[PDB]
Symmetry: D2
Subunit: 260 residues, 4 copies
């Protein structure tokens, strides 16, 4: 009998034991929640399917957020088994590698722009809609993952910064849209973490080593600390919070100027 | 005047109520002279004349949905002008239906794509196609956003996300082009009745609320925005880049007004 | 055996069963923490004495934050039973009634400014210092209560906005100063709540009813929801968060304007 | 016949030819503005008298902002010379050297806090009040100088950050208070610069070189750019802007951090 006794949650974005979604799932399950998972993509099906099976779950559905049908079908299918859900976790972001390697101006093409904002920003709004029925029944909450590159320039984050900034604006509009129906909408601004979202990024732990020295706590966060924070936001303890962007970066965002 | 001999491109003049027209008017007031784009044949006719009331020809096709039209637009302008001291981006668009109803219900994928494409990417594309022409004279870039990116306004919906993406662009552009001495800034203008108000049922009632909340108890004008944009396109703004300047009579500063 | 098993916390600012500190204390106790209490003077003595005896505590010490000595003595006294401490909760704010009733320019005198910033802003920094040793022992955390009047203009809040804005800057400098020692520093920006901090403020109901109409969730927060959030920030689940201003206002802060 | 033909302005805070106020004064005068100046005490009299007459002005009044009387008297004096005023420039900040040299927690005493917030934050609100009548005559504007240490932690800036955070909140409440009367209130957040406010700061030069490396423009601002920008804010071109914090830092504030 944990904090999430009898509560259910959908987790989109588990790619490996390292994804931010995994640390979330572990924290939720650790507290008694029942879990469901999506995969983009059946390259990933087998790994996700009973990757679910550490979590007492078999509920594994295909969901590529580029296709409108895949979204609603995944929620109609997931509708078949579950009344509703007390939360939907959005841990999805993507942009064409080339748009994240070089000068922002030179490498940001129109297509690379479309995919970035499409996969990483609109997806959250689409899922929210297809999930609204399941969420009103249970007056669950929504949660997405953002990054403070939306508010500040980081080298090579480029169009992803614009996408995250759009995402963050969405959370606020979703919170007013769904707030009347008792559905809370929030996001976590996590510090940089070495996950599969770092593959192909040459600067990465040079970024990791910089964050380690600048963050007031002198360390980089983990998927556990992110999971624990996401757990709180998906819980009745966070019942008074909506449209909030919680920074889980060891306070990195608060430093103007460190001892070089 | 202050802008003696400097040149500026003005994209987004649709009518005499333009955010861009009032700015363009302010730019000319100080002696700079001007070039203009139009989205299609429609607006070709109206822009041609708006150019000639400011002593200008420089009137080129630019639908920001087409990549070619953009680069051609900066290629045409190369023939006439050595360089450019600034580019003014006053363009935004969404299916409108995405701006009428509940945010969740009415925000489809296409309406999202169009919103961010026309309203957010365009500035970055123009910035690129304009980079060479802008390096010649160490010009600057300027766009108009809306504080719906930070705060929820009813029926602004997907435009809020786009403007938020836009504002992030300004910062990355300013960091990218800053080494080139090219400044990148934006103006967050208060709401004002322009052709960007057609089809919005709540508008003036939005206008009447802003009139009561703004510390100054009034709504800004296209002139006041023009004057501010004039500064940002001027050497007086040489120390400012990646800045979002709020021209809303301070509305952005109130948490809540007397009922 | 709850989440705060064996953890102790100092609660500053319990004036009544409605105090924000009270909702905090209850949530901390709800999870098994041991509690300590301060009171500003005798008139306030009995209330903390019995408010402590409701959380299994008698540790009740006088602390008026206007006097330097009272602060350090309270922590020298509070030392007397406890080896160390896992957290200090700071829920204190005050300004001369007159300073908060009328035009900001006309009514903001120098002293009223002085008392405002002294009692409501510096106090947190002073307590933090006198609490540093006891906080290093257990690598505890610090928490204070703020209000979004620092960022945004509310009528009749006046100098309290400036003070809370100074407070919020303190959290960031404390978090950077004390973050090196593994001690986290964060604050909660709570929505308006009718407590004894509403006495003498006539606009409250139009305040409460307005926030109720604007907040995405269509309602005003409670000391329970604030307590629960503070509980999280004072817990290892918030180990990855420092220098954060957490908004507990039902998302009110995210609305630019609602159908007024 | 410049932009400020026939316009009048009060300038508080000219300490030397390096003062931020000095480059401001130069910019306003360059455009035809009427100028006035204050000095904190006798020692500085000779130099302020001399700077005024380099701008064709003698309007130089004693004003130490620690004393209430000196403020109103200084504005009582200038009531005598000028019908009204089109703007008041506030370029004053100060804190006890010791509070700006060392760990924030260790060196921030209550007094150093009191003086810091008193001289640097309340002064603007007091001046604003004493200036209201003359400012209503011509509905001029108010302007102060802030620093982004209010949002972000700068080493050794300490209590000055909290004061500037209070200052910035003041601008918003002043703008809301005085906006109805047509008086605009704004502030400039200037990049760091070697002025008389750099004496006694050992890290300054390393700070100057860091901003030069991080700022998108790869350089530090000058009093030219600060003077010119405030000139706008004191001008009818800025008639649609109030309660605004304009950053003149070569974009430094927008970087999360550049190439190492
Ligand atoms: N790792 C960090 O430092 C960091 C910081 C801030 C924000 N974030 C965000 O956290 C989120 C989760 O990342 P993570 O590190 O836990 O692991 P991750 O690498 O697995 O995140 C990417 C996930 O998005 C899914 N996805 C991508 N394209 C999809 C599509 N077209 N259809 C369906 N699904 C698709 C993938 O399944 C993938 O699991 C990311 O979106 C990231 O933007 C990460
Ligand atoms: N009016 C306000 O209250 C307000 C508030 C905040 C921001 N803004 C911004 O101000 C900007 C300028 O607005 P305005 O009021 O001066 O007049 P406007 O109505 O003409 O602005 C819209 C312009 O975008 C151009 N445009 C649209 N789609 C295009 C396309 N596919 N290709 C090329 N051009 C296209 C149009 O020519 C149009 O002139 C807006 O984009 C908006 O983001 C306005
Ligand atoms: N209630 C709200 O809507 C709201 C909103 C935002 C922030 N806050 C903050 O919450 C905090 C706590 O308020 P609460 O509602 O839980 O109960 P409360 O009314 O009791 O808060 C005031 C407390 O400050 C203490 N205090 C005042 N002067 C003191 C002094 N000189 N020395 C020592 N102690 C002194 C008092 O003991 C009192 O308990 C406030 O300080 C406020 O800044 C409240
Ligand atoms: N120099 C920077 O990098 C920088 C950056 C951001 C903000 N600022 C702010 O600009 C303002 C002025 O800084 P500066 O660069 O011109 O240095 P400065 O020393 O040349 O000017 C500051 C002036 O405040 C005056 N002053 C101090 N106490 C006073 C009192 N009690 N009464 C009357 N006058 C008093 C001083 O005489 C001084 O001339 C300050 O508020 C500062 O915090 C400076
Ligand atoms: C920190 C940091 C983040 C945080 N983060 C994970 C995000 O928010 C987003 C990631 C992201 C998006 N799209 C990607 C990839 C990663 C690469 C894998 C995938 N193979 C791909 O094709 N495209 O992204 C960065 C980008 C550059 C530099 C630093 C960072
Ligand atoms: C205020 C306010 C704004 C501010 N504003 C001017 C904007 O930034 C955006 C304008 C906007 C976007 N899309 C539009 C049109 C205008 C109509 C012409 C175009 N032909 C169209 O089809 N679609 O937008 C709003 C949207 C809904 C409710 C209120 C507002
Ligand atoms: C909202 C809002 C708050 C929220 N809140 C509790 C605070 O943050 C601060 C409270 C506060 C500060 N000082 C007070 C009192 C209360 C009254 C008790 C005591 N009688 C007194 O002398 N002085 O306070 C306001 C004050 C004025 C206008 C609006 C608000
Ligand atoms: C950069 C930077 C700033 C920005 N700056 C100019 C300010 O806003 C503040 C100046 C400042 C405050 N207090 C001072 C003095 C100057 C010295 C003369 C005065 N006589 C004094 O006794 N005390 O302040 C810093 C403080 C520490 C480290 C770096 C910085």
């Amino acid at each position: 009998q944990g904090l999430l006794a009898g509560k259910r949650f959908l987790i989109a974005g588990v790619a490996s034991k390292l994804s931010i979604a995994y640390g979330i799932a572990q924290a939720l399950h650790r507290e008694g929640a029942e879990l469901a998972f999506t995969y983009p993509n059946e390259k990933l099906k087998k790994r996700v399917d009973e990757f679910a099976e550490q979590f007492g779950s078999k509920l594994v559905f295909p969901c590529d957020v580029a296709v409108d049908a895949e979204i609603d079908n995944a929620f109609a299918e997931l509708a078949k088994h579950w009344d509703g859900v007390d939360g939907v976790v959005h841990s999805i972001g993507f942009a064409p590698a080339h748009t994240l390697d070089g000068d922002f101006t030179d490498v940001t093409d129109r297509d690379g722009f479309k995919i970035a904002h499409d996969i990483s920003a609109y997806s959250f709004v689409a899922m929210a809609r297809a999930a609204k029925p399941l969420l009103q029944a249970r007056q669950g909450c929504l949660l997405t993952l953002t990054y403070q590159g939306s508010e500040r320039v980081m080298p090579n984050y480029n169009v992803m910064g614009m996408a995250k900034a759009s995402l963050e604006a969405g959370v606020r509009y979703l919170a007013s849209s769904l707030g009347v129906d008792g559905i809370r909408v929030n996001a976590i601004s996590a510090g940089p973490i070495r996950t599969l979202a770092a593959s192909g990024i040459k600067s990465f732990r040079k970024m990791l080593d910089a964050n380690e020295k600048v963050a007031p706590l002198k360390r980089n966060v983990t998927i556990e600390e992110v999971g624990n924070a996401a757990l709180f936001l998906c819980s009745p303890w966070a019942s008074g919070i909506t449209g909030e962007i919680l920074y889980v970066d060891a306070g990195f965002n608060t430093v103007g100027m460190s001892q070089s």
